[PDB]
Motif scaffolding. Sequence first.
Motif, mmCIF file in Angstrom:
data_model
loop_
_atom_site.group_PDB
_atom_site.id
_atom_site.type_symbol
_atom_site.label_atom_id
_atom_site.label_comp_id
_atom_site.label_asym_id
_atom_site.label_seq_id
_atom_site.Cartn_x
_atom_site.Cartn_y
_atom_site.Cartn_z
ATOM 1 N N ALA A 40 0.833 -1.424 0.426
ATOM 2 C CA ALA A 40 0.294 -0.144 -0.205
ATOM 3 C C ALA A 40 1.156 1.384 0.136
ATOM 4 N N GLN A 41 1.913 1.210 0.671
ATOM 5 C CA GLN A 41 3.052 2.270 0.434
ATOM 6 C C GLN A 41 3.261 3.049 -1.044
ATOM 7 N N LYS A 42 3.598 1.730 -1.885
ATOM 8 C CA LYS A 42 3.910 2.382 -3.317
ATOM 9 C C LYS A 42 3.180 2.554 -4.053
ATOM 10 N N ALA A 43 1.494 2.883 -3.238
ATOM 11 C CA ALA A 43 0.512 3.374 -4.363
ATOM 12 C C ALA A 43 0.291 4.562 -3.620
ATOM 13 N N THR A 44 -0.453 5.132 -5.236
ATOM 14 C CA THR A 44 -0.823 6.675 -4.937
ATOM 15 C C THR A 44 -2.801 6.483 -4.934
ATOM 16 N N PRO A 45 -2.865 7.195 -3.541
ATOM 17 C CA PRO A 45 -3.997 6.904 -3.531
ATOM 18 C C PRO A 45 -5.302 7.756 -4.152
ATOM 19 N N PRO A 46 -6.280 7.483 -4.403
ATOM 20 C CA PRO A 46 -7.548 8.185 -5.159
ATOM 21 C C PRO A 46 -7.531 10.256 -4.752
ATOM 22 N N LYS A 47 -7.336 10.484 -3.476
ATOM 23 C CA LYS A 47 -6.515 11.767 -2.981
ATOM 24 C C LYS A 47 -6.268 12.400 -3.794
ATOM 25 N N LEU A 48 -4.526 11.710 -4.589
ATOM 26 C CA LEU A 48 -3.651 12.041 -4.798
ATOM 27 C C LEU A 48 -2.858 11.595 -5.966
ATOM 28 N N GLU A 49 -4.122 11.612 -6.251
ATOM 29 C CA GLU A 49 -3.213 11.314 -8.326
ATOM 30 C C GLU A 49 -2.306 12.451 -9.177
ATOM 31 N N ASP A 50 -3.544 14.181 -8.817
ATOM 32 C CA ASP A 50 -3.050 14.645 -9.540
ATOM 33 C C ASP A 50 -1.742 15.185 -9.067
ATOM 34 N N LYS A 51 -1.596 14.747 -7.990
ATOM 35 C CA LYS A 51 -0.290 15.814 -7.054
ATOM 36 C C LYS A 51 0.878 15.890 -7.373
ATOM 37 N N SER A 52 1.906 16.166 -7.061
ATOM 38 C CA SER A 52 3.864 15.312 -7.145
ATOM 39 C C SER A 52 3.431 14.374 -6.364
ATOM 40 N N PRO A 53 4.341 13.392 -7.005
ATOM 41 C CA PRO A 53 4.968 11.893 -6.136
ATOM 42 C C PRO A 53 5.507 12.659 -4.533
ATOM 43 N N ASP A 54 6.156 13.350 -4.582
ATOM 44 C CA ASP A 54 6.698 14.378 -3.261
ATOM 45 C C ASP A 54 6.185 15.362 -2.820
ATOM 46 N N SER A 55 4.844 15.307 -2.940
ATOM 47 C CA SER A 55 4.034 16.546 -2.488
ATOM 48 C C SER A 55 4.092 16.248 -1.046
ATOM 49 N N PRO A 56 3.562 17.345 -0.105
ATOM 50 C CA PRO A 56 3.349 17.115 1.018
ATOM 51 C C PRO A 56 2.167 15.801 1.326
ATOM 52 N N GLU A 57 0.939 16.087 1.010
ATOM 53 C CA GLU A 57 0.278 14.864 1.393
ATOM 54 C C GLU A 57 0.448 13.432 1.542
ATOM 55 N N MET A 58 1.810 13.169 0.163
ATOM 56 C CA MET A 58 1.929 11.994 -0.789
ATOM 57 C C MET A 58 3.009 10.976 0.548
ATOM 58 N N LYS A 59 3.543 12.346 1.126
ATOM 59 C CA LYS A 59 4.328 12.186 2.498
ATOM 60 C C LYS A 59 3.963 12.395 3.727
ATOM 61 N N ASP A 60 3.039 13.096 2.942
ATOM 62 C CA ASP A 60 1.940 11.671 4.789
ATOM 63 C C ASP A 60 1.516 10.558 5.018
ATOM 64 N N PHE A 61 1.445 10.238 3.327
ATOM 65 C CA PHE A 61 0.361 9.247 3.181
ATOM 66 C C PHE A 61 1.474 8.212 3.382
ATOM 67 N N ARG A 62 2.805 8.090 2.482
ATOM 68 C CA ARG A 62 3.892 6.965 3.087
ATOM 69 C C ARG A 62 4.224 7.267 4.758
ATOM 70 N N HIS A 63 4.161 8.345 4.628
ATOM 71 C CA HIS A 63 4.596 8.026 6.422
ATOM 72 C C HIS A 63 3.587 7.312 7.709
ATOM 73 N N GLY A 64 2.283 7.856 7.007
ATOM 74 C CA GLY A 64 1.321 6.936 8.048
ATOM 75 C C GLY A 64 1.773 5.536 7.640
ATOM 76 N N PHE A 65 2.110 4.792 6.909
ATOM 77 C CA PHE A 65 2.461 3.441 5.945
ATOM 78 C C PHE A 65 3.842 3.652 6.680
ATOM 79 N N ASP A 66 5.252 4.179 7.177
ATOM 80 C CA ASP A 66 6.056 3.442 7.781
ATOM 81 C C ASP A 66 5.826 3.871 9.520
#
Length: 106
Positions: A40-66
């Motif tokens: 799941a940590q490697k996926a792009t969630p439905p709220k963030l497909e428009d965002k850059s891979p390095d966006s604050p929300e994507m950071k949030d997403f992957r860090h929730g998984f860490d």
Amino acid sequence: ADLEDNWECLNDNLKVIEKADNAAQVKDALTKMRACALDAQKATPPKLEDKSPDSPEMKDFRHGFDILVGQIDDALKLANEGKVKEAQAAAEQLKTTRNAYIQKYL
């Protein structure tokens, strides 16, 4: 094999842990949770497909998984010492991390 499938894998294995009778059962289910969390940590969630891979929300997403994976590791340590009930209680708290970090992006 997608996000959603990996999310429901977390839900199913939380149920396995809740219903478990012994540490080996808890370990097996935490193993599956950890594997699904890593996928799941490697996926792009439905709220963030428009965002850059390095966006604050994507950071949030992957860090929730860490954070989640570290907490799974803490629960595995309990189960590896035979502390079934402690490991089950730790797994319940994985729900709070899952709900607060990741849910808002699905």
